[PDB]
Amino acid sequence: TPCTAATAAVRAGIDRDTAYGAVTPPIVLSSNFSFDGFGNKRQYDYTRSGNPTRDLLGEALAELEGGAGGVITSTGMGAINLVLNAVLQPGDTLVVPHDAYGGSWRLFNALAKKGHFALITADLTVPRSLADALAQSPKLVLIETPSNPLLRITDLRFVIEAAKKVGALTVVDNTFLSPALQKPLDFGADLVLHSTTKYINGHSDVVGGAVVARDAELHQQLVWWANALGLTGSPFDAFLTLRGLRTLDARLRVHQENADAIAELLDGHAMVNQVYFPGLATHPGHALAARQQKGFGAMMSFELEGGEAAVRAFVDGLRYFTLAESLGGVESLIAHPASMTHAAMTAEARAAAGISDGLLRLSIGIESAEDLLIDLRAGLSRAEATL
Amino acid sequence: TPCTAATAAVRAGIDRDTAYGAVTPPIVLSSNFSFDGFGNKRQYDYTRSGNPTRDLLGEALAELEGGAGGVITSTGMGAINLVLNAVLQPGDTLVVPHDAYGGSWRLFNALAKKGHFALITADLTVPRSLADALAQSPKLVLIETPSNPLLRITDLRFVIEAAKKVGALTVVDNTFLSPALQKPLDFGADLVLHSTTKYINGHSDVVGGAVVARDAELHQQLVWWANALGLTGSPFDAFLTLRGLRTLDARLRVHQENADAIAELLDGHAMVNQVYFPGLATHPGHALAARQQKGFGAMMSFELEGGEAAVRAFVDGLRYFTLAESLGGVESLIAHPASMTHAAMTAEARAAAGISDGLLRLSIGIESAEDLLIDLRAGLSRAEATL
Amino acid sequence: TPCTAATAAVRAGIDRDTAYGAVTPPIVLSSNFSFDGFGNKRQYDYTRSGNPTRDLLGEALAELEGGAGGVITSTGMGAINLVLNAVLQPGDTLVVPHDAYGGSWRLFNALAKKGHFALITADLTVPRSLADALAQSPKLVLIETPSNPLLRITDLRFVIEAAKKVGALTVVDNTFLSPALQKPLDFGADLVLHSTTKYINGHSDVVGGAVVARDAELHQQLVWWANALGLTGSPFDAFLTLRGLRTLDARLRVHQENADAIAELLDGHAMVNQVYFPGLATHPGHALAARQQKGFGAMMSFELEGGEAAVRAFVDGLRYFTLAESLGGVESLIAHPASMTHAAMTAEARAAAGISDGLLRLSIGIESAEDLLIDLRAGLSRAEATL
Amino acid sequence: TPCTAATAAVRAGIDRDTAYGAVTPPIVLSSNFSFDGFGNKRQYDYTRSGNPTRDLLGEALAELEGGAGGVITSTGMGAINLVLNAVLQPGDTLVVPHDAYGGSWRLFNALAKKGHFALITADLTVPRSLADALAQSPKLVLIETPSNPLLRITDLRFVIEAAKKVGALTVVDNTFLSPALQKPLDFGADLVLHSTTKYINGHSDVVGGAVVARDAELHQQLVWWANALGLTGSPFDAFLTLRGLRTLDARLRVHQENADAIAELLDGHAMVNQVYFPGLATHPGHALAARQQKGFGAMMSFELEGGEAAVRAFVDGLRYFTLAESLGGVESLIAHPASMTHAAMTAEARAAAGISDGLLRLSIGIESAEDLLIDLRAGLSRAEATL
Ligand SMILES: Cc1ncc(CP(=O)(O)O)c(/C=N/[C@@H](CCSCC[C@H](N)C(=O)O)C(=O)O)c1O
Ligand SMILES: Cc1ncc(CP(=O)(O)O)c(/C=N/[C@@H](CCSCC[C@H](N)C(=O)O)C(=O)O)c1O
Ligand SMILES: Cc1ncc(CP(=O)(O)O)c(/C=N/[C@@H](CCSCC[C@H](N)C(=O)O)C(=O)O)c1O
Ligand SMILES: Cc1ncc(CP(=O)(O)O)c(/C=N/[C@@H](CCSCC[C@H](N)C(=O)O)C(=O)O)c1O
Numbered sequence A, B, C, D: 001t002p003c004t005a006a007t008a009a010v011r012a013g014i015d016r017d018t019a020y021g022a023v024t025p026p027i028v029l030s031s032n033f034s035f036d037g038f039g040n041k042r043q044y045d046y047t048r049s050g051n052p053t054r055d056l057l058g059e060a061l062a063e064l065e066g067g068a069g070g071v072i073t074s075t076g077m078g079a080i081n082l083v084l085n086a087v088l089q090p091g092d093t094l095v096v097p098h099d100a101y102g103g104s105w106r107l108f109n110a111l112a113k114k115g116h117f118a119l120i121t122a123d124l125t126v127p128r129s130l131a132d133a134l135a136q137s138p139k140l141v142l143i144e145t146p147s148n149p150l151l152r153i154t155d156l157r158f159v160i161e162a163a164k165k166v167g168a169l170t171v172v173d174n175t176f177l178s179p180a181l182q183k184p185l186d187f188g189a190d191l192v193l194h195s196t197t198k199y200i201n202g203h204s205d206v207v208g209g210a211v212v213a214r215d216a217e218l219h220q221q222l223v224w225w226a227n228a229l230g231l232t233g234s235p236f237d238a239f240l241t242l243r244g245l246r247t248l249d250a251r252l253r254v255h256q257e258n259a260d261a262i263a264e265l266l267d268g269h270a271m272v273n274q275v276y277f278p279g280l281a282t283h284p285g286h287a288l289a290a291r292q293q294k295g296f297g298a299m300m301s302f303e304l305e306g307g308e309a310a311v312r313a314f315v316d317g318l319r320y321f322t323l324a325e326s327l328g329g330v331e332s333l334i335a336h337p338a339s340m341t342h343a344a345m346t347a348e349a350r351a352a353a354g355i356s357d358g359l360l361r362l363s364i365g366i367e368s369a370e371d372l373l374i375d376l377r378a379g380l381s382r383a384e385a386t387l
Helices: A005-010 A052-065 A074-087 A101-115 A126-136 A156-166 A216-229 A233-246 A248-266 A287-292 A307-315 A347-353 A369-384 B007-010 B054-064 B076-086 B103-114 B125-133 B154-166 B216-229 B233-247 B248-266 B285-291 B307-316 B347-353 B369-384 C005-010 C054-064 C076-087 C100-111 C128-134 C158-164 C218-227 C237-246 C248-265 C286-292 C307-314 C347-353 C371-383 D005-011 D052-065 D074-088 D103-116 D127-134 D156-167 D215-231 D235-245 D248-266 D288-290 D307-315 D347-353 D369-385
Strands: A068-075 A093-097 A118-122 A139-143 A169-173 A192-196 A208-214 A272-276 A297-303 A332-336 A359-363 B069-073 B095-097 B118-122 B140-144 B170-175 B191-195 B207-213 B272-276 B297-303 B333-335 B358-364 C069-075 C093-097 C118-122 C140-144 C168-175 C191-195 C209-213 C272-276 C300-303 C333-335 C358-365 D070-073 D092-097 D117-122 D140-144 D169-173 D191-195 D211-212 D271-278 D299-304 D333-335 D360-363
Touching: A005 A052, A005 A248, A005 D211, A052 A068, A052 A208, A052 A233, A052 D248, A068 A074, A068 A216, A068 B076, A068 B285, A074 A101, A074 A139, A074 A169, A074 A192, A074 A208, A074 A216, A074 A332, A074 B358, A074 C218, A093 A101, A093 D092, A101 A118, A101 C005, A101 C218, A118 A126, A126 A156, A139 A156, A156 A169, A192 B358, A208 A216, A208 D191, A216 C076, A216 C100, A233 C237, A248 A272, A248 A369, A248 B248, A248 C128, A332 B140, B007 B248, B054 B069, B054 B233, B069 B076, B069 B216, B069 C158, B076 B103, B076 B140, B076 B191, B076 B207, B076 B216, B076 D215, B095 B103, B103 B347, B118 B125, B118 C191, B118 D288, B125 B154, B125 B191, B154 B170, B154 B272, B207 B216, B207 D248, B216 D074, B216 D103, B233 D235, B248 B272, B248 B297, B248 B369, B248 C100, B285 C191, B297 B307, B307 B358, B307 B369, B358 D140, C005 C248, C054 C069, C054 C209, C054 C237, C054 C300, C069 C076, C069 C218, C076 C100, C076 C140, C076 C209, C076 C218, C093 D005, C100 C347, C118 C128, C118 D169, C128 C158, C248 C272, C248 C300, C248 C371, C272 D333, C300 C307, C307 C371, C371 D005, C371 D215, D005 D248, D052 D070, D052 D211, D052 D235, D070 D074, D070 D215, D074 D140, D074 D169, D074 D215, D092 D103, D103 D117, D103 D347, D117 D127, D127 D156, D140 D156, D156 D169, D211 D215, D248 D271, D248 D369, D307 D369
Parallel strands: A093 A118, A093 A139, A139 A169, A169 A192, B095 B118, B095 B140, B140 B170, B170 B191, C093 C118, C093 C140, C140 C168, C168 C191, D092 D117, D092 D140, D140 D169, D169 D191
Antiparallel strands: A068 A208, A192 A208, A272 A297, A297 A359, A332 A359, B069 B207, B191 B207, B272 B297, B297 B358, B333 B358, C069 C209, C191 C209, C272 C300, C300 C358, C333 C358, D070 D211, D191 D211, D271 D299, D299 D360, D333 D360
């Protein structure tokens, strides 16, 4: 029988050292590998092309996503970059979501201005906006679900089938939920990618990406382009990332416990105008998220009553929510997308996406529920004292 | 509120970098630190004496245990060696447990044979044996609870009060439960120590130790001795250990779920003569463990029916229990104490400990309970097929 | 005075830690950095965009090359990729050397097939071939000198001036000599780039790249593109790379001592048909290399008498020259460019470059001259025994 | 031929990976190694006992010193502690030098006060003081040559023969010259040890120690005791240390060049009362150093004219000599032994060592000789301006 996803993450590279029988995999930093006499390349030759420590992480994320293999890039942006270079050429069109990560928006828009591809920026949750984008015969559709930072939910089965009907490949950015909470390849997607910086690593001490292809042929094309462009990651970073992955299933139980308790505090608290969290029955996308996700996750964002003064008072004095970029760490974080995560967007693209100036995003960590709730209650008082 | 234990473990070193505001603490590998001009030592001078990355792990273990300070050593045995050198000299007597870790037994017996101290090896679970050791006016009593590998429960209240009445210091090896599950200092111990190699690091990729003193002055004596003897550990190892500590709570919730289910399978199974697990109501010590511990942990051992042939058949074919030394890893492990963890002991001292040639010890990981039970049931069949 | 290049390399990041006064710089792995309250970005925010450990290496290479700043990429190919994306768009033409690194050939040819730019492949050492390339109004000319693997020398001042006259930017791949042996920006080049994998790191345990721009504005454009494409390097790799740089000047004295003694053995030895080494007065490019370089380096290639049988016998039995890819490490290496480093080129592109099926390339390390010479003499005998 | 010292250091662990043929050795962090089925220990079982990455550094130091084996410890002081515990018991006498490292003095005086052994502190450069110590039938003599920080030269032939005639073991602290410049085991010492923190690592980013025994049985005793006491170091530190070792020869060529130039400046400069540097023909011990060493090294100390005010003015404004502890780094360093390296000693034991309150010690780096002399001349002016 096969093991579960949780077993496979915990045991990736365990007892797989033929040299010494090390239980925990050795770090192979070596740039280079000997040939076995003249003309006899071993399995590995050069670390930019292939490295065994990085391949343990690739093979582990491929097992977790149900793919034919994985490529580990220096950054998550690099994983998106790898997919655009492998799949697209001038004259091909790309469809992307309106409310994707601001750095995704930045790369799509910079590479389209150069004419590497034509860009259609669409709302993939509105059937009309989708059908108009697919009727332009795109080579590639990118889905980001749940979306950063408003947690809009796109219907994987629906969009993937509609993309296949017009001959488009699909790629899903699965960063916000990780493989442990969403498996886009199960619904027929061709590619899934991550910022490993987030949950997969879990300790905010690695920036990395991953791409997993369903098909062996498309995996080989990603290996070729990652080598030729020089986008592959450092073995040290793969080592820490693999170490991280071993606690992903354990981390996520505590994250989701904390996130449910915090959603219940923020939803119809008098100082809170709107919570965006797919776990609330009132959230547009809740029933989709409960169907295509194994849990509702631990990212959420919210709008305070009381304009900019309430935001400043809420944020200044948080002891357990560090005001910082990134997400998916064991440590709780808060960000202000307008000035931080989505500062790379124009004011116009933020307004089209529906990211206000008052929006705060929480990355809820694995600290004790009680300490996070006290911290958030004190912020809600500092905000109220602003009226 | 100060924070909970889980919050303190998650947040140790977080947002505590004055140079750049790094969220996650920088690794300070440097052997040396500049003076602030002639005659002005800064806080740090030299890594053997004091290092800030090491001191983040020291401070976090002191906070979790309730102590004045911590000293991080290169190994767990190094921690035991630090306490013996800081506290004892020739003419002092040390009391230790009969069923301690065999590497502990090896060090106690080697240093006693040199004349560094006189040794009394006693059953600290039995009032009689304890009172006969305390009648000899020891300088120091060492407690290991629960004990490796039979999980005997020493009564902390009882043994620490009786030792204080004869003027003895107490030290507890708290390796097997970690600070998250037992706090010997709350019972009045002078010292608690750990192999951080186990649950504190949690990833089987560091060997380390720590000692936490209740009292500031004994903490300064340990700092002095660790520096003089050169027993302090590496900043890189401290970074990995602090990183592992952040998931200690999350890991222990899965370790304990999995161990409660495996105990249920082995207790009363036709192929199991004996199970040693403090969480079983029929383990002597259950009621004690329920009151001095916050959980029953995830270490257990057991004796199969069917002699040597049953042991060999059980062990050959385990897929998810790696036959290896150590414990407290995310990865499940099995050991044969007689030929592995306790081979450092004489056949005689093992018989006095009541560690038999058939004993198997499990360190239960954080893999899916379903996989670990399928693996153990197939082992129990393979052993049954032996009769 | 400023210090010398050697002083600056040895002391890059020495005594620059404001937290503790650490003599050697801390490793800042953190993905993220706190804000200093709401709206107050610190100097660093996110490691893909900027990280202080990577910036020490950036700043050190910029100081060594005489530039406004340095960007550190995951790989050397990545550094080339960063320059092609920052500088070129469809319709711009690029001029590259005919005998550049085969991975450079692969990337140029793959992005030109996609139409990211038009490609002119020229012999930059032949005036006619250059003037015909420059008469086509290119946006960018890339020079690789000395060339891999034939050590062809291109006249930096000549080519850079001819490029400035038609409005072209120049970029020089300075991997083969490092900043310590050639400074292309001194001759007016706009950009210099390296595989830090080679001499700068020096220890074959990092794959990395660097790009240094003369002008502050072009440096800012590289920071922008490196962030948006996600091409930035791991801080751990920057740490090891900086540690490596500290011995570059010391390593290169022994490399060049060993290379001079090996060129003298190989040149007009009866089994050696041709040596390509810029230190020989007979080498096309010697007087140029003596003018525009501070030494002749430690890369060289050679052609044995006796066809494929002589190659196979020379290579099989080398004790001190490991048959592997890469170069610039303290360990001596040998490669066969046709089947290894230049296997990415078509047979047609190799023949146009003048890379035969018989060519061997040596990366001469810092072992004792005597042991390397014995190893090479025994290889020359095994080669002679095949006639 | 076997290879030279330089070749052995460069090539230690090169091409010695059976799993992938990694050129540079993998980092084996694992605490634990699997058994090959029930009852079959592999070569490695547990990192505290034995680790292959650590053993590559042990084996390379043994090869360089001509011994049977090496044991790598967490610190240099840990190496001294290992030897004291493996060899001595109460009733034994140890002879140590009057002018040893102050941390050595602290350990000897602390463990003698406990009664672990009787201590004789003697001037081993003076025949009379030596013979009076040897007339007491010591179990062990420790030599430190050259001595920290006055560079006194002990006669290895003389002291080791005199100690063998009374049945005493000898151990030499070879920290100050490294195996590349002195080999105590060629003179018949039983043991040689190092702070690997200094020249062997060479990059001021590891604290470590090593002990090499001439005889295979004493090496086995050191392995046993290091294991039992838990003094063994971290695999990560061994990896960095072996990495630094590879440039030991190249670094020492520059260190020695720079040190000969600085000795030339300080010897008979009008502001310099005394220089202690074995390479000066007038240093007592010159002729001995010339015969028993392969170079005079790069440690020196000196006494300025002009009392405390001259010291303070010399030290304030040094740009290239960091005021800090340690030595043997690529970075130049300056220490005040009385307030820094030797503050662990009493004013009396310093007076007996003849370490005055005016003494400054230089660790000369591999920066440009021209820069280090500009820095020192400006320091000498600043001190002159004081009269
Ligand atoms: C959904 C999604 N996909 C990709 C990524 C990529 P990676 O590893 O950081 O490269 C992310 C990352 N999101 C992050 C990173 C914010 S950093 C923005 C500031 C920086 N100064 C910049 O210019 O980029 C987030 O939403 O916090 C994501 O949410
Ligand atoms: C209760 C307890 N205290 C201390 C330690 C110390 P450390 O980090 O390994 O130094 C332990 C470790 N127990 C471990 C490690 C045992 S491995 C013994 C084999 C080795 N060949 C040897 O000779 O030592 C265990 O019981 O698995 C412990 O259980
Ligand atoms: C001159 C030059 N510029 C750039 C680089 C780039 P980097 O760090 O490896 O990414 C190099 C590297 N040269 C190297 C690397 C050869 S690895 C070839 C095999 C590999 N299987 C592949 O497909 O690429 C060399 O010439 O040895 C160079 O010589
Ligand atoms: C000759 C010699 N033997 C051993 C050592 C051992 P290790 O790696 O530091 O443990 C040394 C070290 N010399 C170093 C020691 C750094 S001084 C540290 C002062 C510190 N606050 C303390 O109390 O110890 C030196 O002389 O600079 C040596 O010179």
